[PDB]
Amino acid sequence: GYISFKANGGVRLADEEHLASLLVDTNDYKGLQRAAADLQTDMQRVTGKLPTLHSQLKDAGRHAVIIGSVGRSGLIQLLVEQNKLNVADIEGQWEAYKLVVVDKPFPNIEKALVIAGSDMRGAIFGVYDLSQQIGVSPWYWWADVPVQPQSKLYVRGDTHIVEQPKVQYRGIFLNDEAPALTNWVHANYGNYNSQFYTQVFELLLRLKANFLWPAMWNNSFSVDDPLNPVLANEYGIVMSTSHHEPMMRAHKEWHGMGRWDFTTNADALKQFWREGVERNSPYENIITMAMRGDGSEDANVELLEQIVEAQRNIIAEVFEPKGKQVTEVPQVWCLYKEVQDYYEKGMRVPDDITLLWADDNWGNIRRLPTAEERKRSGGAGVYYHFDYVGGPRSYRWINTTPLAKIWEQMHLAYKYEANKIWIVNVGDLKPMEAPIEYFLEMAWNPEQWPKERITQFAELWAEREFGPTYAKEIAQLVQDYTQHNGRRKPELQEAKTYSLLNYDEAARIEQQLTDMESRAETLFNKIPANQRDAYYQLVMHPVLASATVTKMYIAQARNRLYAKQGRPIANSYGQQVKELFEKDAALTKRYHSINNGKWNHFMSQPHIGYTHWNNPEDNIMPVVSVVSKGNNADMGVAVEGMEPAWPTQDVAFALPTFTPYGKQTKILTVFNKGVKPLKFSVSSGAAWLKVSASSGEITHQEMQIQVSIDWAKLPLGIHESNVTIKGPSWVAANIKVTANKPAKVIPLKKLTGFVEADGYISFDAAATTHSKAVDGFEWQEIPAHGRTHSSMSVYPIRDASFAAPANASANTAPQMHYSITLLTAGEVTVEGLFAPTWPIHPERGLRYAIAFDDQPPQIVDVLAGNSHKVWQESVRTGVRRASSKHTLTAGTHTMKVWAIDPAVTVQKWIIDTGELKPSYLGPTPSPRGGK
Amino acid sequence: GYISFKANGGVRLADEEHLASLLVDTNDYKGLQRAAADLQTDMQRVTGKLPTLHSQLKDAGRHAVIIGSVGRSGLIQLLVEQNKLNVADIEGQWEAYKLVVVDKPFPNIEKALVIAGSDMRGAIFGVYDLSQQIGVSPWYWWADVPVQPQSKLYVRGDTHIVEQPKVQYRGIFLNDEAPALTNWVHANYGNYNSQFYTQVFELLLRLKANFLWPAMWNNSFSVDDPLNPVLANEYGIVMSTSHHEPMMRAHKEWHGMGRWDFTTNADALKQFWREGVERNSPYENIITMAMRGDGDEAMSEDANVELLEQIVEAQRNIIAEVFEPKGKQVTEVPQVWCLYKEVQDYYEKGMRVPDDITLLWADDNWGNIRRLPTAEERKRSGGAGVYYHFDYVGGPRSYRWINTTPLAKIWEQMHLAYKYEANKIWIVNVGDLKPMEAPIEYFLEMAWNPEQWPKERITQFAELWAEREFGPTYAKEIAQLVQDYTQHNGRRKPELQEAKTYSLLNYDEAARIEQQLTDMESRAETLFNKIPANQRDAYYQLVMHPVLASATVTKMYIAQARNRLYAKQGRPIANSYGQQVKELFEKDAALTKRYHSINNGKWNHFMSQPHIGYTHWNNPEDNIMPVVSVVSKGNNADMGVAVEGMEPAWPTQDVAFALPTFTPYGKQTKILTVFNKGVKPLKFSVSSGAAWLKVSASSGEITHQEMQIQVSIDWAKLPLGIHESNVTIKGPSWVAANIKVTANKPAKVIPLKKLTGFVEADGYISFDAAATTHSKAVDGFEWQEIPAHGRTHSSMSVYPIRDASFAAPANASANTAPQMHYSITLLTAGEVTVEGLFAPTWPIHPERGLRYAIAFDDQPPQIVDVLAGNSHKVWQESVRTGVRRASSKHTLTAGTHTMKVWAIDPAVTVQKWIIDTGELKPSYLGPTPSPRGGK
Numbered sequence A: 001g002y003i004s005f006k007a008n009g010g011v012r013l014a015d016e017e018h019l020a021s022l023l024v025d026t027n028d029y030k031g032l033q034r035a036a037a038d039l040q041t042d043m044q045r046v047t048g049k050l051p052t053l054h055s056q057l058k059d060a061g062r063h064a065v066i067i068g069s070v071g072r073s074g075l076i077q078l079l080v081e082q083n084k085l086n087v088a089d090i091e092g093q094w095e096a097y098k099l100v101v102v103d104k105p106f107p108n109i110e111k112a113l114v115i116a117g118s119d120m121r122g123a124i125f126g127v128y129d130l131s132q133q134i135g136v137s138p139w140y141w142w143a144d145v146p147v148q149p150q151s152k153l154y155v156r157g158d159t160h161i162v163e164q165p166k167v168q169y170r171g172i173f174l175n176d177e178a179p180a181l182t183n184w185v186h187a188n189y190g191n192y193n194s195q196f197y198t199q200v201f202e203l204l205l206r207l208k209a210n211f212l213w214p215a216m217w218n219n220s221f222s223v224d225d226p227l228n229p230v231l232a233n234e235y236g237i238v239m240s241t242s243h244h245e246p247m248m249r250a251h252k253e254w255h256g257m258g259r260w261d262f263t264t265n266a267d268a269l270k271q272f273w274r275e276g277v278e279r280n281s282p283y284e285n286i287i288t289m290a291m292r293g294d295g296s297e298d299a300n301v302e303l304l305e306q307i308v309e310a311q312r313n314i315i316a317e318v319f320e321p322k323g324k325q326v327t328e329v330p331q332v333w334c335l336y337k338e339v340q341d342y343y344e345k346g347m348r349v350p351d352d353i354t355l356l357w358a359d360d361n362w363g364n365i366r367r368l369p370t371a372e373e374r375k376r377s378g379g380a381g382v383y384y385h386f387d388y389v390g391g392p393r394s395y396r397w398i399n400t401t402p403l404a405k406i407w408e409q410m411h412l413a414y415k416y417e418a419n420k421i422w423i424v425n426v427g428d429l430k431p432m433e434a435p436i437e438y439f440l441e442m443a444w445n446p447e448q449w450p451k452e453r454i455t456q457f458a459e460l461w462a463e464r465e466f467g468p469t470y471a472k473e474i475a476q477l478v479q480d481y482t483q484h485n486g487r488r489k490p491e492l493q494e495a496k497t498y499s500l501l502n503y504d505e506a507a508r509i510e511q512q513l514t515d516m517e518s519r520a521e522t523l524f525n526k527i528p529a530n531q532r533d534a535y536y537q538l539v540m541h542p543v544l545a546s547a548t549v550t551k552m553y554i555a556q557a558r559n560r561l562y563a564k565q566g567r568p569i570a571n572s573y574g575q576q577v578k579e580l581f582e583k584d585a586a587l588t589k590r591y592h593s594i595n596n597g598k599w600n601h602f603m604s605q606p607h608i609g610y611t612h613w614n615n616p617e618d619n620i621m622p623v624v625s626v627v628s629k630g631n632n633a634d635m636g637v638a639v640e641g642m643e644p645a646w647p648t649q650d651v652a653f654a655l656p657t658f659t660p661y662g663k664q665t666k667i668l669t670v671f672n673k674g675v676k677p678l679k680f681s682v683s684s685g686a687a688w689l690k691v692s693a694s695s696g697e698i699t700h701q702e703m704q705i706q707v708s709i710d711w712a713k714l715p716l717g718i719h720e721s722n723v724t725i726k727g728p729s730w731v732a733a734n735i736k737v738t739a740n741k742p743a744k745v746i747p748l749k750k751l752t753g754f755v756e757a758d759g760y761i762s763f764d765a766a767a768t769t770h771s772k773a774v775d776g777f778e779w780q781e782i783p784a785h786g787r788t789h790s791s792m793s794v795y796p797i798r799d800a801s802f803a804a805p806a807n808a809s810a811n812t813a814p815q816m817h818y819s820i821t822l823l824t825a826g827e828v829t830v831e832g833l834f835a836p837t838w839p840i841h842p843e844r845g846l847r848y849a850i851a852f853d854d855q856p857p858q859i860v861d862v863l864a865g866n867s868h869k870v871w872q873e874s875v876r877t878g879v880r881r882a883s884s885k886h887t888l889t890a891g892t893h894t895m896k897v898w899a900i901d902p903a904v905t906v907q908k909w910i911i912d913t914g915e916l917k918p919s920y921l922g923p924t925p926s927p928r929g930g931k
Numbered sequence B: 001g002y003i004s005f006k007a008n009g010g011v012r013l014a015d016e017e018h019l020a021s022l023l024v025d026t027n028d029y030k031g032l033q034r035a036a037a038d039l040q041t042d043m044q045r046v047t048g049k050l051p052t053l054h055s056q057l058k059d060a061g062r063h064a065v066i067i068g069s070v071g072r073s074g075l076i077q078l079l080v081e082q083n084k085l086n087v088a089d090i091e092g093q094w095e096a097y098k099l100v101v102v103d104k105p106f107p108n109i110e111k112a113l114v115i116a117g118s119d120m121r122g123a124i125f126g127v128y129d130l131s132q133q134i135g136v137s138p139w140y141w142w143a144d145v146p147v148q149p150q151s152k153l154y155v156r157g158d159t160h161i162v163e164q165p166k167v168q169y170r171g172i173f174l175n176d177e178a179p180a181l182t183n184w185v186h187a188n189y190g191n192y193n194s195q196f197y198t199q200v201f202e203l204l205l206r207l208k209a210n211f212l213w214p215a216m217w218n219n220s221f222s223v224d225d226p227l228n229p230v231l232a233n234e235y236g237i238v239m240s241t242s243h244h245e246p247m248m249r250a251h252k253e254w255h256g257m258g259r260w261d262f263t264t265n266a267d268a269l270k271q272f273w274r275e276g277v278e279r280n281s282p283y284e285n286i287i288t289m290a291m292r293g294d295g296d297e298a299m300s301e302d303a304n305v306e307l308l309e310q311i312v313e314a315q316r317n318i319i320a321e322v323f324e325p326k327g328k329q330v331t332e333v334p335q336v337w338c339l340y341k342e343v344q345d346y347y348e349k350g351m352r353v354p355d356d357i358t359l360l361w362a363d364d365n366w367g368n369i370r371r372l373p374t375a376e377e378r379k380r381s382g383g384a385g386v387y388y389h390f391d392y393v394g395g396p397r398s399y400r401w402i403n404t405t406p407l408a409k410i411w412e413q414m415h416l417a418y419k420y421e422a423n424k425i426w427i428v429n430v431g432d433l434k435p436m437e438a439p440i441e442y443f444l445e446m447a448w449n450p451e452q453w454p455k456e457r458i459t460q461f462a463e464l465w466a467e468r469e470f471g472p473t474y475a476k477e478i479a480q481l482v483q484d485y486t487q488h489n490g491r492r493k494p495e496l497q498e499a500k501t502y503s504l505l506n507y508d509e510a511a512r513i514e515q516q517l518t519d520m521e522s523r524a525e526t527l528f529n530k531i532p533a534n535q536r537d538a539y540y541q542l543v544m545h546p547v548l549a550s551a552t553v554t555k556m557y558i559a560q561a562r563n564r565l566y567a568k569q570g571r572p573i574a575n576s577y578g579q580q581v582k583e584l585f586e587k588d589a590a591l592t593k594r595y596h597s598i599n600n601g602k603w604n605h606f607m608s609q610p611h612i613g614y615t616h617w618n619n620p621e622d623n624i625m626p627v628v629s630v631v632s633k634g635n636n637a638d639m640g641v642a643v644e645g646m647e648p649a650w651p652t653q654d655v656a657f658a659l660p661t662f663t664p665y666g667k668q669t670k671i672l673t674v675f676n677k678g679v680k681p682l683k684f685s686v687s688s689g690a691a692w693l694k695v696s697a698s699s700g701e702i703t704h705q706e707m708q709i710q711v712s713i714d715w716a717k718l719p720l721g722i723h724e725s726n727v728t729i730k731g732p733s734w735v736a737a738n739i740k741v742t743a744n745k746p747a748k749v750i751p752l753k754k755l756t757g758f759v760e761a762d763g764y765i766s767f768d769a770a771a772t773t774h775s776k777a778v779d780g781f782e783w784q785e786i787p788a789h790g791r792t793h794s795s796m797s798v799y800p801i802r803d804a805s806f807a808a809p810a811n812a813s814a815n816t817a818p819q820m821h822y823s824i825t826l827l828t829a830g831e832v833t834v835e836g837l838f839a840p841t842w843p844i845h846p847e848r849g850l851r852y853a854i855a856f857d858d859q860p861p862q863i864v865d866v867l868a869g870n871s872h873k874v875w876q877e878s879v880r881t882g883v884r885r886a887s888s889k890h891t892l893t894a895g896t897h898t899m900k901v902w903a904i905d906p907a908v909t910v911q912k913w914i915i916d917t918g919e920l921k922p923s924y925l926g927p928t929p930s931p932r933g934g935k
């Protein structure tokens, strides 16, 4: 950046006793003067010394910061008049600022940093740019991020920065606010009054945002404190309402006036709306239009048109005497659900009204502008969710939105030109600090944050708050817990989520999570003391809390399964459920206790015990089973991959089939259902079948027998034998083992591509062997996207579809090629895992084409078979799925994928060759041959 | 009876100081003299005085008992010579006896009871007939039944008893004997030696039985004590072996001689067999024939048949050779062969089976006889018999612990055996013997003469047995307790019971079963305190232990079921049901301790069989307390609602909450249960959305308790047709619970008394098979009631037993066969499904099924075969559940109908009909019988 912490011949903001003078015209915007005053205290935070703030150039010292708007600063204007400054690059622009150094701007001033803005907010944003660069995080108060001391602050002489936003209105919606934000606000401020809201306004400005929808569950912004809109307007925050709160009226303001129904109560509604728009007319707003009524298709469309027409006439009547026409008063309409269909079927919407497109409440944008809609003077915007109360189930507790998910969807919005308004539902605001800042930095300029800077954003954020030493590790912790929560909201997690039986999924997840926790715990003791509060609330708490909920359900799953199997070890897992549940409570209490209880109530959202879409009233520890012991030695055997334990009537006991490149060692677990010593023998029925022990003895512990194959002693083809385990009882346990060796087993080093094992071939979409670009379009990797690794998608963004390929050599579109080795000849099923995206362009699907070798390509639409139930499952799991069937010979093959429609974004491919088993995430990527 | 406890001018067996003299010839059979000595001691048990025992007429007093065999008593022979006695009615017969009074049999004797037998055992049985009549139960030792004291014993002067058995060989198999019998035997006798077996011999003779298969899991009768067979033969017990132990060799005796395989090891097997048969040749036996080799499974049917013919020929030659130097041809040496499973098929397809060998037909290990003789087979000189089970180790699951065989089940199957003439051998697997005392005696009394024990005396047997052991005052109540616990156990073996058996959701089944079991326990406990002190050991082991033990196991699984469901529903009350599981498991354990402690630990080990914790056919090594769930509470008030008939509790995503539909004659009050998942006070309101829908409360407040809301219909305010409304329950959360209620009133509701027959309600019509309106007899045949048969009430079957099928009725006018008619009232017009519950019987005559025909009103009859779709799996479920099922579909108008059932094939035995009119739900036993119209 442009700030140096040692002398550099530039502008001297601070150097020991010497501090630059801050200059702002007392006739400039009050909101800019206020921001200048914040810069004054910011510099004291950094240097320990308070710089002076003057309005007259004559009172300035040798070095100065000259702050002003082009329109109202006598300082900026004098510099322009005397050609010390040119503002042609910002003049007339929306929220632009220029930071430049000027030599001898005035006789008593040697050097000045000039901060010039096109308008009030432009100048404010330039001021807070400087605040952050000298070391004051936007989150210095809102997340206790310490301000690193500096005795020296210098501005580079060649500094020349010209900035302005790409999205015109950028901000947040405080929502889902009880119990957490609401009980904190009431404890600290009494209510959602202007002492609370000025803390919110300041945060938004420091993040270069300008837009707010206020808390409305049980509050009315303009009524609860008349200074709320006055201070919003003075600060520079543009106010609006959520999209079912029309005409500047909060939801709760409608009382004692009859039914919310325009067909029967229009006069009352119209007077209510008129007085609302009149009341807030002194302030900078965007007015919400239309309405959702309470209690025929052509009748609906007609009614909505009447309503909007009536609202337009109200606005005209209010603002006409104030010298404004209806087309000069910002207005917004969210065309939501059926209303979108109304609109596509020809409903009329005045051209100047902004069309706000909503996501699906789960981070997937439902609709974006078409080529013809982009011509509307009102433009369009996006309303996005980080938090939601509704179906299929609420998620309200901690951050569950990975940065890369945000990137991929908001980049589509940017490219399809929904750039009038970007607003995100932040729930209680905390603990969404990182994705809030990402969303708003992206809104400022999406081109400054391309997909190759997704990881870098998190690293840079961590470096700013905590310093460089552990920045990479801290960024990775955040990327890791958010990716994990992106797999399934904590509220939606349960015992059955991660598989105990297949591909060691629950065990792998538990280990991942535990390693994340250990990293987070360890750093707590290594960072400086004044970082601990910030670190706890921004990193350690969400990591430990996220891990604890999942581990709790995995322990529950084990308690339940092992109890069904009759294993007394089940009780130890029941004890683990209790410990993890208690740990969840202890973490919440810690969050409520740090920094003398500053953040008490913010983690009070219930998140354990959901049985339907709405939260329980409190956390409830999950149900556990209790296994009793007998007395005499009594043997059971648990078999890897199976729910029933031996002995069980009418069950064929078998280990999963061994394959040459699959899992090589599998477990039989012998256990005692009594207390007296249990002696047993173990024998194999074939020379190729190996067991790790020939006998054992146990009392209250279990014993694992490892089973494996000697492939050299196994004939070609499919063969079966038994492991026999003989305990005290005269009936021995016989566990069948099968091994399939279709041919001589070539060493993996000498194979090509991803190799079939254990009934499947699995690989990340980015693990291509070749990529072919066509007409400047190419499948490219989105780092850290999706549930397990990354995704691929076509860039640049098209607003047209490629032709499907006629044959498997057609170069109609960019392609991805993969290499595989198939052992099992026959029909395979290739499933892709995709971002759960919508048909954001009417009547256009999410098609791709796929073929092996020179077989005729098949067209697959990810959205084929779409339904409400299919959509529900796409947001519960975080992916959409699509598949195709192919017949292949044994040997090597090339899988080919062609792009067709835009916005198809694929993370993983899973090929079922016949024996694929269910899991939440799919098997981990297959063995890969040595080239 | 013929014994009086006051003077009556007959034979004075005892009167204070005066006792009759017992007379038996010292040249008569040793085993009869032995029985006479037991009578001497039995007399002392009753009177405290020992009668004298002499051989010489000179020594007798003025009253005497003269005991002898026709063939070897000089006493009996003299009486016959002088025409003081006639024995034409018993001479030459098998095991016959005669009890009569003779005046002045000799100069110094004024009166005598004469006990004359056609052969040794006939005489013995006569002796023990008298022992029992003076007051010594067969179970005086084996179940601690007290001997009532009497100072006076008189034989009525008109006594004239002539008895002989219908079944020639009658007895038991000690089996499944470890751990319980085996550990008791070892503690008391050291091993299965003659000190143990003479106790068994005596019991069998007192029960008028004569046949035994000995314990063979880890013992060899003839080897463990050489006196075993010596004393068996001397006492009069005919010895044999179980049907895979050929040629008088126990299973364990085969060791160190190579494979049990005739193809490769014939010479060793033959010598082994020859030595066995030679060893036991001095004793009265039936020799088990054939063999099951170790590798018969690997071999073709053709080869198996050839090999069996070879083996049996070789065995016959061995017997011929062994007995020729003795006085006997092979056709004079009793032999038996159980043609079992596929070997039965071998026989039906032409395998050679020598004509004089007795054919033993086994049951299916679950009390259903697999096969009985055909008309042509009854001509075979060897005859046929039945091997029956009271206990079994094997599939689908072992049952080893307590008595699970109701008397009426035994009656109906053994009666078929009798009428199809399998009367050469009746033998029953009794497991450890105890606690099968009542059904053992029943089986053996029936074997003695099935005609003395018709179905109309099934209840009476139990009452007479209770009266003998405990006296008349509470005999009927005691008999009812035994009938109740055995009926219940006949529904599902304790070993096979589990949480899911009895329904928590439908027809209040688990709650009703629990209450019936609790009330049975209360009767047993109340009676315990009323009986005399010296009857309490016998009462405990014969009545109270099995009653409480049977009840406790079922109640335990019901408590587990509630714990599991309520835990899934998130109800903290689940934890109290978890505690009940524990208490009931501990009670089971304590009852076992009590059984092992009575009478100074006399019966220690007999109840040690593990019976809780089965997961496959073979027992666990110890009882294991069932798994329970633990529910946790939150803090804040949080409302749930459990809905009667539904597993999910409110709130649950994607579930339509509704009470079962209300019908005019169905259940009138149904329950919504409001509960708190937290601890703080929970307030709520309750409202109905319709004037016809009534709720018992409009608001409530709970902390730790649940609250039931009763829901019901005001039928007068309900319009005709089907209507729905909601009960709305509003708690703390802003999301209210809406439970749908539906009521179906197809017409004006006539009072039940004005209706006729069984009335549709809640989607079904249900009634006992005996609840007929008419029972048409045809050609001397009639459907008749078997009392106490089946799972809930009784059964109906056609008698007399036929060995031919009626013609199926060609149409509604056909009077081909006896018919049962029932009356019903249907509210729901349309298709119905009529299911019958039947005895789980086999095709006991090859090529013949279990058909009946059924129709409503004048509609055409449909023929149903109960065995249609038969399979191993269908068989397994029939023995798990105790019934076979069959069904038919009919389309009926609303209104009154007559259901009609025609007999076709024999041995169709039906206990219950359940008609599904569209909404029948699953339950173990089916709904209780429907409301019955007054008309």
Ligand code: NA
Pocket (backbone or CB within 6 Å): A176, A180, A387, A396, A397, A398, A427, A428, A605
């Ligand atoms: Na929240």
Ligand code: NA
Pocket (backbone or CB within 6 Å): B176, B180, B391, B400, B401, B431, B432, B609
């Ligand atoms: Na037993």
